[PDB]
Ligand SMILES: *[C@@H]1O[C@H](CO[C@@H]2O[C@@H](C)[C@@H](O)[C@@H](O)[C@@H]2O)[C@@H](O[C@@H]2O[C@H](CO)[C@@H](O[C@@H]3O[C@H](CO[C@H]4O[C@H](CO)[C@@H](O)[C@H](O)[C@@H]4O[C@@H]4O[C@H](CO)[C@@H](O)[C@H](O)[C@H]4NC(C)=O)[C@@H](O)[C@H](O[C@H]4O[C@H](CO)[C@@H](O)[C@H](O)[C@@H]4O[C@@H]4O[C@H](CO)[C@@H](O)[C@H](O)[C@H]4NC(C)=O)[C@@H]3O)[C@H](O)[C@H]2NC(C)=O)[C@H](O)[C@H]1NC(C)=O
């Protein structure tokens with residue numbers, strides 16, 4: 001009956017000390033007559049006792065969805081500690097365990113290139129600015145466009161794709177009106193990854 | 208299980224008359240006891256007669272996989288016919304079903320731009336040729352690289368991404384030795400998609 005789902009922190013969260021990276025253990029499909037769900041958290045095998053279990057919430061399909069949220073230290077996540085959520089409930093034969101961590105393997109620093117649009121992309125009102133980020137590991141990364149300090153709206157990012165040698169690459173596309181690229185605005189592609197200095201770099205682009 | 212998955216034909220196959228496009232019904236996790244799975248196959252409400260059930264496979268999860276494949280007309284699939292696979296096995300409460308067809312909607316043709324390498328990237332031994340394919344619908348597409356008629360090995364393609372307007376885009380990345388880029392070789396990105404004239408377009412790139 002009950003299914004357990006264990007979610008990692010957001011990459012922008014693990015990479016900036018101002019933010020609060022958290023692991024979330026989500027139990028769904030808990031019957032009405034065995035609703036008491038117990039949680040235990042282990043960090044690299046030692047039980048931790050500081051997780052905040054939000055009070056159960058009855059779903060419209062007549063099952064309880066219960067959530068528990070453990071906060072993690074940024075150096076704990078990035079040093080490769082394993083997080084074991086252990087969910088016990090009297091609807092279960094025996095308790096369910098789920099574990100989560102950063103990806104094993106040595107970090108690799110992404111190279112960041114910014115490509116300008118094709119000449120064939122001038123006969124349009126809109127134009128595509130491209131940012132290639134390649135050779136990074138593990139694949140937790142964050143890509144963001146801006147110009148003149150303010151963020152950009154119209155950008156899309158592919159998912160991280162596996163190259164032959166084990167590392168990852170992706171592309172981010174910023175659609176801008178040809179006018180602004182003509183005028184000469186500078187657009188910037190900002191990349192946040194653990195293997196970067198200050199965890200952040202930025203590449204700029206203009207006519 | 209018995210849990211049913213239904214897959215569509217590969218794109219390349221539905222776009223050339225020479226290849227054979229098949230829809231593929233996969234029953235993961237059949238039990239050793241009562242392993243007799245059955246299949247039936249509806250095309251737009253007409254039972255068809257020519258399916259090829261692959262005998263068995265047996266997994267290291269002491270359970271079985273039972274694939275049936277059904278071959279399809281190229282115009283049948285491109286015209287949006289529904290392909291109904293129905294699975295009868297006594298271990299199931301009642302017959303399972305699944306359906307598949309092409310994404311509904313007006314096919315939109317891809318725009319194909321090729322981007323040269325970044326100036327930054329030329330201080331390396333290897334170099335990334337990029338190919339942006341954008342504006343296409345439905346998202347079944349094929350992308351390949353070639354030079355002097357002969358194919359390329361070292362290219363990877365991102366899966367297709369949804370833009371705000373309902374079309375898709377992707378990038379292909381070919382990794383070549385900076386020496387070949389300078390000798391002046393001509394590299395070609397070849398796109399195969401059902402909205403293109405002759406289902407095929409091709410863009411070229413050189414120093
Ligand atoms: C009864 O209802 C509840 C709740 O639904 C609510 O009420 C009903 C009535 C409807 O109106 C609902 O629409 C309504 O919202 C049902 O609860 C659902 O249960 C299903 C499964 O039964 C769960 O599916 C899983 O979803 C996860 C991803 O979930 C994230 O994204 C969802 C949107 O897509 C979002 O709704 C989720 O809440 C969650 O969002 C994240 O939440 C965390 C914490 O809150 C947060 O930190 C994140 O930031 C946030 N993200 C976003 C984007 O918002 C999905 O990953 C699961 O897929 C995995 O598991 C499958 C096996 O179960 C497997 O087949 C998949 O392929 C995939 O497998 C994983 O694969 C990776 C590799 O890619 C591998 O590494 C992993 O090991 C592997 N994992 C596992 C476990 O195998 C899965 O699809 C829903 O999340 C859940 N919804 C909610 C809201 O809780 C309940 O099921 C209903 N009961 C029924 C129908 O009987």
Ligand SMILES: *[C@@H]1O[C@H](CO[C@@H]2O[C@@H](C)[C@@H](O)[C@@H](O)[C@@H]2O)[C@@H](O[C@@H]2O[C@H](CO)[C@@H](O[C@@H]3O[C@H](CO[C@H]4O[C@H](CO)[C@@H](O)[C@H](O)[C@@H]4O[C@@H]4O[C@H](CO)[C@@H](O)[C@H](O)[C@H]4NC(C)=O)[C@@H](O)[C@H](O[C@H]4O[C@H](CO)[C@@H](O)[C@H](O)[C@@H]4O[C@@H]4O[C@H](CO)[C@@H](O)[C@H](O)[C@H]4NC(C)=O)[C@@H]3O)[C@H](O)[C@H]2NC(C)=O)[C@H](O)[C@H]1NC(C)=O
Nearest residue numbers: 212213214215216217231232233235236266267268270274
């Ligand atoms: C015990 O063993 C078996 C055997 O597998 C073994 O275990 C796994 C974990 C691996 O280690 C294997 O190496 C190993 O062999 C396990 O059985 C598996 O269980 C998982 C659990 O979810 C199933 O996942 C499903 O996968 C299919 C897609 O399967 C393709 O890709 C897989 C990854 O490459 C690959 O394994 C398959 O062979 C298959 O490959 C395709 O094959 C076709 C021909 O058949 C070929 O033409 C294609 O080219 C090829 N493609 C690729 C990419 O390789 C996926 O469809 C399922 O997703 C649906 O259902 C989920 C619910 O379970 C749900 O979360 C998903 O979101 C999705 O649901 C749909 O979502 C869409 C999208 O939004 C939505 O619109 C739809 O409404 C919704 N529909 C439905 C009906 O849900 C799912 O992800 C595996 O199929 C299954 N078998 C294998 C071989 O993995 C078993 O789990 C093991 N026990 C464990 C792990 O505890």
